[PDB]
Amino acid sequence: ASDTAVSNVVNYSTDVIYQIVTDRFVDGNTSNNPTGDLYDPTHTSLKKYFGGDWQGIINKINDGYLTGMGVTAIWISQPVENIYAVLPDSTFGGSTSYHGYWARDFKRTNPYFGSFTDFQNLINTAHAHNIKVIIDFAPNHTSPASETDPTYAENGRLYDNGTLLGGYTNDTNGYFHHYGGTDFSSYEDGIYRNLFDLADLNQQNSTIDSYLKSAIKVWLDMGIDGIRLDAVKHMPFGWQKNFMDSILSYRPVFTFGEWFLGTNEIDVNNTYFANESGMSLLDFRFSQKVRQVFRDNTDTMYGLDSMIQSTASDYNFINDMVTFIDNHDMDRFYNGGSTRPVEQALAFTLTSRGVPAIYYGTEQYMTGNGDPYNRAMMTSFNTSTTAYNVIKKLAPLRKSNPAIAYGTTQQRWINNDVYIYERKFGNNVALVAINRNLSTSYNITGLYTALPAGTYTDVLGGLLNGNSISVASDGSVTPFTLSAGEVAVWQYVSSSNSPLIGHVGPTMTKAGQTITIDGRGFGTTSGQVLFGSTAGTIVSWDDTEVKVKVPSVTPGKYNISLKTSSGATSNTYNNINILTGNQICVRFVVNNASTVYGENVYLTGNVAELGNWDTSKAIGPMFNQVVYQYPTWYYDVSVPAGTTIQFKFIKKNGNTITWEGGSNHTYTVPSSSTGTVIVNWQQ
Ligand SMILES: [Ca+2]
Ligand SMILES: [Ca+2]
Numbered sequence: 193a194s195d196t197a198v199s200n201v202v203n204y205s206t207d208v209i210y211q212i213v214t215d216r217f218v219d220g221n222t223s224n225n226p227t228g229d230l231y232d233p234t235h236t237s238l239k240k241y242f243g244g245d246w247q248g249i250i251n252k253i254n255d256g257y258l259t260g261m262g263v264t265a266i267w268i269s270q271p272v273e274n275i276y277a278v279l280p281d282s283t284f285g286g287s288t289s290y291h292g293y294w295a296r297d298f299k300r301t302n303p304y305f306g307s308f309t310d311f312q313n314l315i316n317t318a319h320a321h322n323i324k325v326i327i328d329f330a331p332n333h334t335s336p337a338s339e340t341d342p343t344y345a346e347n348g349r350l351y352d353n354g355t356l357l358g359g360y361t362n363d364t365n366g367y368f369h370h371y372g373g374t375d376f377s378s379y380e381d382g383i384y385r386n387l388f389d390l391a392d393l394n395q396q397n398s399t400i401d402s403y404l405k406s407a408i409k410v411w412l413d414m415g416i417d418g419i420r421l422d423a424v425k426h427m428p429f430g431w432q433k434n435f436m437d438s439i440l441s442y443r444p445v446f447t448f449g450e451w452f453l454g455t456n457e458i459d460v461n462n463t464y465f466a467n468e469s470g471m472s473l474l475d476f477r478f479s480q481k482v483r484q485v486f487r488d489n490t491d492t493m494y495g496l497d498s499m500i501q502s503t504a505s506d507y508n509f510i511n512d513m514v515t516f517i518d519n520h521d522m523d524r525f526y527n528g529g530s531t532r533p534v535e536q537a538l539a540f541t542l543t544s545r546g547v548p549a550i551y552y553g554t555e556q557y558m559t560g561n562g563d564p565y566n567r568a569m570m571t572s573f574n575t576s577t578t579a580y581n582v583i584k585k586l587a588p589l590r591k592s593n594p595a596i597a598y599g600t601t602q603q604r605w606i607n608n609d610v611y612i613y614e615r616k617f618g619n620n621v622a623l624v625a626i627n628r629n630l631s632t633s634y635n636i637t638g639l640y641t642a643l644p645a646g647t648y649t650d651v652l653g654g655l656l657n658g659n660s661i662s663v664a665s666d667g668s669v670t671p672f673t674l675s676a677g678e679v680a681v682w683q684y685v686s687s688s689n690s691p692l693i694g695h696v697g698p699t700m701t702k703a704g705q706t707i708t709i710d711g712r713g714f715g716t717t718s719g720q721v722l723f724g725s726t727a728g729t730i731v732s733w734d735d736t737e738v739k740v741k742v743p744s745v746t747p748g749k750y751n752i753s754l755k756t757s758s759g760a761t762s763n764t765y766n767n768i769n770i771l772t773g774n775q776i777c778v779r780f781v782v783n784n785a786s787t788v789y790g791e792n793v794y795l796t797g798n799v800a801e802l803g804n805w806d807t808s809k810a811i812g813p814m815f816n817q818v819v820y821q822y823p824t825w826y827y828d829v830s831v832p833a834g835t836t837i838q839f840k841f842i843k844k845n846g847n848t849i850t851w852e853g854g855s856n857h858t859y860t861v862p863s864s865s866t867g868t869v870i871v872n873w874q875q
Pocket of ligand 1: 304
């Protein structure tokens with residue numbers, strides 16, 4: 193098959209996701225609408241159900257709105273059952289689960305969004321039209337709750353396909369966390385404490401780990417093509433890594449979590465998570481910078497480039513980064529006045545690296561600063577808007593030009609207002625020019641490009657004032673004037689191709705599994721795929737896509753390369769994580785581990801999942817506030833199930849590594865449930 197086929201659920205680099213808040217899009221069926229205080233037929237009470245549903249989404253696919261726009265994927269609200277309680281809101285006089293983030297039963301659907309048959313209708317309709325379906329999923333909590341007053345809301349109660357498990361109050365089984373609420377003081381604090389008043393699920397509890405793992409398979413069984421994990425910054429990395437493996441070994445689908453980063457914010461945990469969790473992240477570094485430059489004027493084009501550059505050094509898999517300019521949590525990008533800024537932001541996002549996600553109603557210039565004003569009902573479905581057409585013209589390039597989907601990015605010209613960059617994947621090239629200044633034109637001289645000598649017209653057809661250009665044999669471009677607010681896109685798509693890997697998914701595997709290598713020039717007759725210098729088993733070989741079975745190599749990260757039947761060797765795609773086996777989440781605890789000021793305790797050990805004795809890649813720094821207090825440290829770690837591990841704890845700083853004394857601690861990871869090991873620091 194092809195890397196662009198709707199069936200390639202492990203690669204979204206050639207796609208454009210359209211984010212829909214189900215309730216605020218289209219009420220395709222009035223018979224399923226809530227009744228009473230839960231519903232607001234006038235669409236004025238922003239926190240009540242307005243009636244949007246899966247049938248309405250289906251309607252926009254069949255009538256050509258979404259398709260006509262060039263959308264290849266849709267990300268919808270969490271489909272699971274939510275609480276029916278209407279909470280008190282002083283401002284909006286009513287607060288409901290219209291958003292779908294207040295889970296009640298993860299094994300059932302929200303009656304107002306539709307039945308499982310309705311959900312299926314949607315999945316089948318999307319696919320029939322070559323559209324992938326992404327679902328929001330929030331395993332961090334259930335719903336708003338007061339353990340002191342079980343009368344408030346539905347007590348954060350959790351059901352298992354109808355049968356109640358328990359609520360926040362009198363939680364004798366310990367399904368939830370009872371450490372009060374987070375004040376975001378630390379990474380650990382925001383994990384084991386509640387997000388505001390939402391009942392915190394305790395996924396270290398065996399029953400909870402199993403429920404969640406079994407609940408996700410329910411949806412995978414429904415045919416979904418991707419998952420959006422909510423608040424991945426508020427759950428342990430160890431559990432999530434273990435949860436990711438559970439998904440990937442069942443039926444691998446592109447997965448990306450939400451790890452909010454503020455303006456100018458960079459978090460080394462965020463980077464580490466994106467690189468080791470087995471899942472991808474939404475680019476908040478991208479999004480925030482983009483808004484600083486095109487929307488709020490708190491930064492220039494030099495900051496847009498530093499982001500492009502730094503972001504490419506920190507992320508092992510930048511082609512997996514989900515980019516956006518706004519969402520259900522941010523103020524709507526269009527703030528009034530000129531719409532050029534949004535239009536330029538959309539073009540820049542659409543031609544840049546990663547996976548473009550577009551918040552619904554952007555193409556319609558919808559405005560709204562703050563939740564919930566930024567979640568108003570779909571205004572209109574007008575296809576004349578410049579925005580709608582920028583997407584129409586740009587979206588398809590992600591399937592037609594490998595450079596745009598997988599290529600690197602390079603700044604070819606720049607000043608405070610102008611950004612000219614190049615996307616390159618072998619001989620395929622894409623060059624983009626953007627002038628953010630709405631009142632000043634620039635004379636572009638000294639511009640060079642990888643585009644072949646020739647005359648190139650604007651892909652946008654002058655939609656954003658772009659024009660054609662002429663390139664010489666030496667790559668030089670004839671001087672041209674970039675008008676105010678101009679965006680021009682020029683490209684070259686090679687006819688021939690040497691073997692080039694532009695993508696590999698999933699990034700976290702195990703021997704015996706199958707991975708998909710995507711690119712160009714692979715050939716039609718099978719060659720060879722290598723994990724290091726070890727050849728794997730070809731499951732299927734095509735010019736743009738190759739599927740292979742992971743050889744039984746020593747667990748760890750491997751660099752992939754491919755050799756054509758003509759002996760042509762490709763480029764390598766590095767850092768694919770081959771695990772020891774099925775993952776299990778174990779909580780490691782160490783007592784009496786006292787440290788001097790600014791010194792932390794980490795976990796190193798026998799397996800790859802533990803860093804194989806490499807103190808530089810040791811697990812930590814471990815936690816020591818919520819669950820257990822210093823000097824006892826603990827950490828939730830993903831480890832190979834049913835394996836006997838030798839490990840030791842250490843105290844690190846920057847210029848001292850103190851190892852535990854005595855002999856390595858031993859433990860045999862449990863086969864099916866979560867586990868806990870407790871030991872005392874050995875002198
Ligand atoms: Ca409805
Ligand atoms: Ca949590």
